[PDB]
Amino acid sequence: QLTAAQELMIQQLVAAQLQCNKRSFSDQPKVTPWPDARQQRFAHFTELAIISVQEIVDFAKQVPGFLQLGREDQIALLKASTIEIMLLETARRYNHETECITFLKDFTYSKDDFHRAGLQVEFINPIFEFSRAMRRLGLDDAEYALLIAINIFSADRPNVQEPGRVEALQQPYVEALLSYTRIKRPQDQLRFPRMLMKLVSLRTLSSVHSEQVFALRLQDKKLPPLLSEIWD
């Protein structure tokens, strides 16, 4: 059974996830409308990424223990995980019946909509493959929030000054996930390792993204200062 201390920690994760998502709903009319059609779509996805960076920063701040790390390590952790949390979050917002992704909470996008924005098949295909594989695991809101916390507290990230402290903070989240999964599916048991293995997939996805970041140097419109920095 789950420990009361573990439940508290999870309750805080789910509340922060719900608060940050809700905070971004009001941005729906503020984003450039979906239809040069290609450029407008590219600028639309760009604005959506900017908002996602905000939610991630805002959520991480609410993760128990994140605020006790040094300021330099906090930023270093957030720099390397932003792409991976965006991917994790994309998967949570993926519907396999319609085969579509819900951004904000009304805005629906299909595989072809990303292709029509000038994004390469080299990157869009793995995104949808990852979303489908995540869907089969049947994660709930708590399981994603836990997985995102584990991802944030990665000690091997570049420019991390106190990796021992980062690693020690990841421990309760892995523990809570182990406990949470054992109660939800007592007869599976392979489900928990299958979740952790998705963190391995995320490493490759981030690496594929860094190679696809090259294709963006070709189009005349440059990425906003924020996005251009986090990704290159």
Of the candidate spans 7-15, 17-25, 41-49, 209-217, the one that interacts with its own copies by CB under 8 A turns out to be: 209-217
188 binds its own copies (CB under 8 A): no
Tell me how crowded residue 169 is: count the other CB atoms within 10 A of its CB.
21
Q: Which residues in the 148-187 window bind its own copies by CB under 8 A?
A: 154-156, 163, 171, 174-175, 178
Compute the C-alpha angle 2/195/147, nearest 5°: 65
Closer residue to ligand 652 in complex, CB, 71/217: 217
Closer residue to ligand 652 in complex, CB, 114/192: 114
Q: Report d(CA 46, CA 227) in Å as an integer.
A: 8
Q: Which residues in the 25-84 window bind its own copies by CB under 8 A?
A: 53-54, 57, 61, 72, 75, 78-79
Q: Report d(CA 232, CA 230) in Å as an integer.
A: 6
Residue count of the chain: 232
Per CB under 6 A, the list member of 114, 153, 180, 192 interacting with ligand 652 is 114
HEC sequence for 137-174? CCCCHHHHHHHHHHHHCCCCCCCCCCHHHHHHHHHHHH
Token pair listed for 92: 């949570």
Token pair listed for 147: 């997985």
Q: Which residues in the 142-171 window bind ligand 652 by CB under 6 A?
A: none
89 binds ligand 652 (CB under 6 A): yes
Q: Which residues in the 178-207 window bind ligand 652 by CB under 6 A?
A: none
Closer residue to ligand 652 in complex, CB, 55/73: 55
CA nearest neighbour of 228 among 218, 213, 215: 213
Which residues sit at the interface with ligand 652, rule CB under 6 A?
Answer: 24, 42, 45-46, 48-49, 51-52, 55, 83, 86-87, 89-90, 103-104, 114, 119, 123, 127, 216, 223, 227
